[PDB]
Curated annotation (Swiss-Prot):
Phylogenetic placement of the source organism: Eukaryota, Metazoa, Chordata, Craniata, Vertebrata
Full-protein residues shown: 654 to 763 of 1689
Disease linkage: Renal cell carcinoma: Renal cell carcinoma is a heterogeneous group of sporadic or hereditary carcinoma derived from cells of the proximal renal tubular epithelium. It is subclassified into clear cell renal carcinoma (non-papillary carcinoma), papillary renal cell carcinoma, chromophobe renal cell carcinoma, collecting duct carcinoma with medullary carcinoma of the kidney, and unclassified renal cell carcinoma. Clear cell renal cell carcinoma is the most common subtype.
Domain Bromo per the UniProt entry, residue ranges: 1-110
Organism: Homo sapiens (Human)
Quaternary structure annotation from Swiss-Prot or TrEMBL: Component of the SWI/SNF-B (PBAF) chromatin remodeling complex, at least composed of SMARCA4/BRG1, SMARCB1/BAF47/SNF5, ACTL6A/BAF53A or ACTL6B/BAF53B, SMARCE1/BAF57, SMARCD1/BAF60A, SMARCD2/BAF60B, perhaps SMARCD3/BAF60C, SMARCC1/BAF155, SMARCC2/BAF170, PBRM1/BAF180, ARID2/BAF200 and actin. Interacts with PHF10/BAF45A. Interacts with acetylated 'Lys-14' of histone H3 (H3K14ac), and may also interact with other acetylated or methylated Lys residues on histone H3.
Phosphoserine sites (modified residues): S36
Name the UniProt record assigns to this protein: Protein polybromo-1
Summary of the tissues where the protein is detected: Widely expressed.
Length: 110
């Protein structure tokens, strides 16, 4: 069984994962797993602390987050990373902005 804190962390995680735009697209999809270092080596020269949602979920399911802010900080790092690597005109950049706002609104509601 999972702790109440794990259940709250999961509610925040699922809110980001499952958010859909007006067309029904989950903006989380590209963030679930980073490209490999072999695939995209220059990402890892620009981004000093890589993060994706696979990492966050396994940490949460390993009962390692002591509170909600610790998870939020990892999401914020991931979205900051996406917006550092990609240009502001790009779709991934814009998706990261929206999901960062979704994250904060979810934390406020909970
Ligand atoms: N351009 C990209 N930027 N960022 C990510 C990315 C993925 C997960 C977590 C954080 C991230 O920043 C992925 C990207 N692409 C995937 C598709 N193939 C081209 C590279």
């Amino acid at each position: 069984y999972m702790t109440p804190m794990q259940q709250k962390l999961n509610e925040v995680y699922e809110a980001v994962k499952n958010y859909t735009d007006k067309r029904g697209r989950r903006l989380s999809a590209i963030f679930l797993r980073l490209p490999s270092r072999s695939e995209l080596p220059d990402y890892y020269l620009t981004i000093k602390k890589p993060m994706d949602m696979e990492k966050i979920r396994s940490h949460m399911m390993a009962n390692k987050y002591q509170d909600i802010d610790s998870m939020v900080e990892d999401f914020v790092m991931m979205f900051n990373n996406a917006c550092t690597y990609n240009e502001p005109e790009s779709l991934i950049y814009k998706d990261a902005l929206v999901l960062h706002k979704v994250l904060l609104e979810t934390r406020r509601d909970l």
